[model samples]
Target: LNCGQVDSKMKPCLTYVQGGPGPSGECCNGVRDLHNQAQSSGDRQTVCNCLKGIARGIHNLNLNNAASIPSKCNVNVPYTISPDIDCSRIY
Candidate 1:
């Protein structure tokens, strides 16, 4: 998926990443949709980079929450869920 698409897909998670009573219901759905999008290693890498980009655009993304998105959503992605994640390693 494209970076913009990733941004849109993950927008619902913004609040939770910044600080909230955990992710919103729609947030996990977005996470799951993203999981479905990453059908290939190339797609996974794109998703990883897009996530990192989104994290960078934010002002106060909690590392704990950011890192916990996948696990909290019960979607085990290949890459680590962090702003500083190394996208190249995702593939």
Candidate 2:
């Protein structure tokens, strides 16, 4: 979600992605927002695409922890967090 300036709204997840103390309450809230918003299959792929882009751009992200975000946050997302991911197959 960043080209030059990152989307401040989505910046909360950086705490988890960077392997900080764990996902913040706000970060978990964002995960829930993603789970709630990406309902239809088409939309899921759309979200997956966005997530993939975000994941790729990040530096020093703990991808294993990233993979656990949905579960950790008590949200539902078919896709896992990885540098290499295919959106269409997940949903």
Candidate 3:
């Protein structure tokens, strides 16, 4: 995810794995690749915004139990920070 942050100027803020300590190298690499693609497609901002939205959604979920975050921002599943996922991988 560091690559994603560095290359895209966006944080690949992934969530903690349920039974794991942190994200794997492969996952980080995937994020980087996704960011690169966005850059190539001239959609970097769009992708980054989506990631930020997911991050905000997750924060809301953690802050208030009033509304459940969509599965895309749940953080209970494996997902990428670039492409949309079933849950928010970006923190």
Candidate 4:
């Protein structure tokens, strides 16, 4: 789905999945925790809320990286949720 097309409630889930590190340990832990909580309380909203925070954090980290680089050297940096960007590209 497009960025603007996501539902407000589902935004968190979409963001979490988008920002996640490809099913890594940390990501799996978070998914498991949220799933368990949702199952126990039948509160899907709560799970989505928690994931929203995670997504926001990840997005902020990306923004920080974009801002930290020198303007001349920061033409089109990519923000991959899985692998860290290789910033050593020789211009």
Off by over 4 Å in 1: none
Write candidate 2's Cα lDDT for 1-91 as tens digits.
Answer: 2222222435788877888777778878877876676678776776777777778888997888778778888887786767777877974
Best model number under lDDT: 1
lDDT scores for all predictions? 0.85, 0.72, 0.38, 0.34
* lDDT (Cα, 0-100) at 49 in candidate 3: 54
The total number of steric clashes, by the backbone 3 Å criterion, in model 2 comes to 0
The true-structure Cα RMSD of candidate 4 reads 15.5
Better of 2 and 3 by TM-score: 2
Per-residue lDDT, model 3, residue 28, is 52
lDDT by residue (tens digit), candidate 1, 1-91:
7988998888899888887767878999998998998899889888898888889888888888888888888998877777788888754
lDDT of 4 by residue, 1-91 (tens): 1223223323333333443333334434433343444443325433333333434555434433223222222222222222234223312
Candidate 1, poorest ten consecutive residues by summed lDDT? 82-91
For every model shown, the clashing-pair count is 0, 0, 8, 0
The TM-score-based order of candidates, best leading, equals 1, 2, 3, 4
* TM-score of model 2 vs. true structure: 0.83
Pairs of colliding residues, candidate 3: 1-28, 13-90, 13-91, 71-86, 72-86, 72-87, 72-88, 73-88
